[PDB]
Amino acid sequence: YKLVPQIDTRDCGPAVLASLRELSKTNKQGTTALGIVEAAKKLGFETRSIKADMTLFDYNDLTYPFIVHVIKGKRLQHYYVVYGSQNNQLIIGDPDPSVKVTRMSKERFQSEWTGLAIFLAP
Amino acid sequence: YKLVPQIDTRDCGPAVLASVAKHYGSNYSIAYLRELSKTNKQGTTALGIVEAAKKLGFETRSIKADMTLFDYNDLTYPFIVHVIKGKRLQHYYVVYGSQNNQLIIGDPDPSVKVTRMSKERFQSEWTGLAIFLAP
């Protein structure tokens, strides 16, 4: 589960992306979903974004890994990486150096998750 | 329910901002809120709406909620919500009230403007992010 951690309080977008700062745009308020999409396009990846709910993790034909837009307190533009699910838990990567790859409850992820999932494939 | 429509492909953020700051008197040009909210080619981010609304003399609180939020009658309308509309992954609405199983929303889209919307459709578009602001 190779995850590249964040450094600045703004590079969360790029940080999930790699797992660059200018390609999306990333400015002071972090990246916008459209920015992640655009930047992933430039890098030779097909992208489809979807608005989903928890049933997305019931699907067996889900192509991991992918990006999710999440809200952490007042990090209203946060992003995770989703590598898989196991039992009733998710394996996610948080660019936040204090978190990185973690087991996370499906409940907790539901509380943070926008429903925005960005899928990419070459 | 007054609503400042969007013109540019990017100004949805600024447009909901003006549309609300208008409700408590203040009038601002979209070209300016654009600058305050740091809106670029890729629209505004929730942080942009928050910062800009503060700068405009508003105490603001953002929250992550679900539809149960509208089962609380002492909800103070109006407020801004982050929604997903098609490829418009950053769209925003104004929420003016609720009546029946339906909400009254303001969509800066000149073709939409103020509209009633079912609880279901709004649930499908909505992030859960609600931005409440007060002078």
Numbering used by the authors:
A (entry chain C): 6 to 24, 38 to 140
B (entry chain A): 6 to 140
Please share text taken word for word from the publication where this structure appeared.
The ComABCDE pathway is the quorum-sensing system in some species of Streptococcus, such as S. mutans and S. pneumoniae, in which autoinducer peptides are processed from the precursor ComC and concomitantly exported to the extracellular space by ComA and ComB6, 7. PEP is a highly specific peptidase belonging to a cysteine protease family. We believe that PEP of ComA is a more suitable target for inhibitor development for the following reasons: First, PEP catalyzes the initial step of the quorum-sensing system of Streptococcus. In this study, we focused on PEP as the target of potential inhibitors of the Streptococcus quorum-sensing pathway, established a reliable high-throughput screening system using a synthetic substrate for PEP, and successfully obtained a compound that was found to allosterically inhibit PEP and suppress the quorum-sensing pathway, which eventually led to attenuated biofilm formation.
To address this idea, we tried to resolve the structure of MuPEP1 complexed with Compound 1 by soaking and co-crystallization methods under various conditions, but the diffraction data revealed no bound compound molecule. Therefore, we prepared another form of MuPEP1 with the four N-terminal residues truncated (tMuPEP1), a form that was found to be crystallized in a different space group from that of MuPEP1. The side chain of Arg66 occupies the vacant space of this binding pocket in free tMuPEP1, whereas it is rotated away to avoid steric hindrance with Compound 2 in the tMuPEP1-Compound 2 complex. There are no other significant differences in either the overall structure or the catalytic triad residues between the free and complex structures of tMuPEP1.
